[PDB]
Symmetry: D2
Subunit: 212 residues, 4 copies
């Protein structure tokens, strides 16, 4: 798609959608930094920064160091997330808390660290990965879906806060994990092809929500 | 509306919407228990139980005691909530955490304690008070709106989980606080007039969201 | 509900939802005029006016006569409609045309004849009966659902046009025909209990659309 | 994007979005047929067929001739439309009728002529151009918005009818006319990059609907 000379951040980049998206931006010519709670392999095709999105103080330290060295952040992709399933009244409190800590608190921490960069640079793009579970109640995914609804809500709110600065802020809502297809939708929303698309949420699940 | 002989629980009953709704159920003839983090006055027209919805262990103890004595819970109204405002990148971590702890975790704790009662009794009604902030991004209310989107999502998911048991589960989304009007909408959704209405969300804000 | 001293118009009043709603307003003490393409029985509990909503010139003549004699129109209920089913590529052109003529053109004609009354009187309520078919694609109901989506859209647009005059304009979306339950929802939306509810659409179908 | 060897139909191809989209498919290597009520210029870069989408008998003759000669229809883009504005009670009956005849009846006629081709070939893509007016009430656009809501509804219904045949059916909702940007979104939805996206509607209006 040609993101050459563009600086791109992708969270949850160690695995799944985040990894696929980081690889896609690399192939499109972008300078990519991938962030994750930890990295397993010894070698990655993008720059790696250990950063758990759920850890506010760590996100603070890492982002603050990186932003001091970068002239602009062309795209931020929030793709970190965890899935913990169970009936609402059977879900453990640990699972409930970690679900929200990662799925909502993570993007919140990123937004707290990056919003001023977006304001000052006056443009760029944010893509946040939610879930079709945020659109329709799914069996066993009450907490997951709820956290992903909060994430989508937060993403559009940040979109409104950054609209005056010319930042496009969109959401992708995948179904059950395919990662390469999600990556294609993220790249599109991050590209100049989508320059008048903001506050939108594209559901990529083969029509499962029937337009919801 | 005549809820005589009906057993009704209302959370956040010390003030605002919860109080207005508890009073309305009392006037309609219901046996009402009001719950709040604390009670200020010395006298209330409903039975009062100190219970912070955000405190899982307390919710456990109180609900478990009460359910052992009650044959059925005809209506549960989740009306506890807190509002903490600010730009996304300026909001304190304390405000972020308490927002979610109360606005989402609260109803989660109630659902964990009451879902089996609803299943076993095979019917009844749940009404959950969200916000129009969950429907459209509002300035200064990014976290509040996000928490209220999670709450609505969770409420509809519990609605789906309890649909087989004949429980109606609906949401009311008020604008900025009027409490008596919200109470009227809650009573309607809790009544037998609304017996085929479930998984719905009525926005009561004078059209502010333009149908969103 | 006590609509005594209120003047109420209900279209499609000869049968189904319109009839049930007209009867309910009569029982609540309202002065009711029912309108239909034709009336079958010899006796009705409301005043009857033969008026096919699809016939613009007839709607013009009837409404213009009636409005000259009435000081205010407290509630207008659009409940006329027809259902013609079939696969999209099998539906006859006659069925397609009549579907839109009645389901959309009907309310359009009413709005053309009544909007100035609402503006001049500065208040009142409009309730329009759409369908859950307008919310989610239903098998065999492509044209019906499409016409009902247009109707809902038109109703909210008229709601916006009349918001400055203090008119509340809401939609009820029933599932497959129960009429007494729909009537209860219409009366609620038309009442002073719902005075801060406008541009809303309540789906009454037992949760079939899963919140859509 | 490389649609070489793909056969693509675009309606409303003489001007605006339809023209821009037809040109874009040509540049991407597709075999393009453009359809319009009439063609003004003497020369176009795509094959042209005079066909008013609103004229069912003409659509029948033209489509039936063309389908007899084509092995597959890889993409259908419905981009015909007219805009007639005015307050609801001031809009002329001619404007009301033509709005629906073109904006809804047009795609209906195309669907009646092409659905069996899509079923038999077992795949392909449909993109239908609605409007952000279908998402939120806009001043002066009550009829236009209503017709575009019907169009979107019909498009998703056809999407459901063709889902079993592997056809992707999506909607693009532009704001006030930019055509090249809409064309980019249409090409994306028509491409194999979007192979798991169906029944979706992308609003391209710079965030005007605030996610609605």
């Amino acid at each position: 798609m040609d993101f050459s000379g563009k600086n791109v951040w992708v969270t949850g980049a160690g695995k799944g959608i985040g990894y696929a998206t980081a690889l896609a931006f690399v192939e499109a010519g972008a300078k990519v930094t991938g962030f994750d709670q930890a990295f397993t392999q010894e070698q990655y095709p993008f720059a790696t920064e250990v950063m758990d999105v759920a850890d506010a103080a760590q996100v603070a330290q890492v982002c603050q160091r990186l932003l001091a060295e970068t002239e602009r952040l062309d795209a931020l992709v929030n793709a970190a997330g965890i899935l913990r399933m169970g009936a609402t009244d059977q879900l453990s409190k640990e699972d409930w808390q970690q679900t929200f800590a990662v799925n909502v608190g993570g993007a919140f921490n990123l937004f707290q660290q990056t919003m001023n960069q977006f304001r000052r640079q006056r443009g760029g793009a944010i893509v946040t990965v939610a879930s079709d579970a945020a659109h329709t109640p799914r069996i066993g995914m009450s907490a997951y879906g709820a956290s992903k609804a909060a994430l989508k809500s937060l993403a559009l709110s940040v979109g409104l806060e950054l609209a005056g600065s010319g930042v496009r802020c969109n959401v992708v809502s995948p179904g059950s994990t395919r990662p390469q297809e999600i990556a294609n939708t993220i790249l599109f929303l991050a590209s100049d092809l989508a320059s008048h698309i903001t506050l939108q949420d594209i559901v990529v699940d083969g029509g499962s929500t029937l337009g919801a």
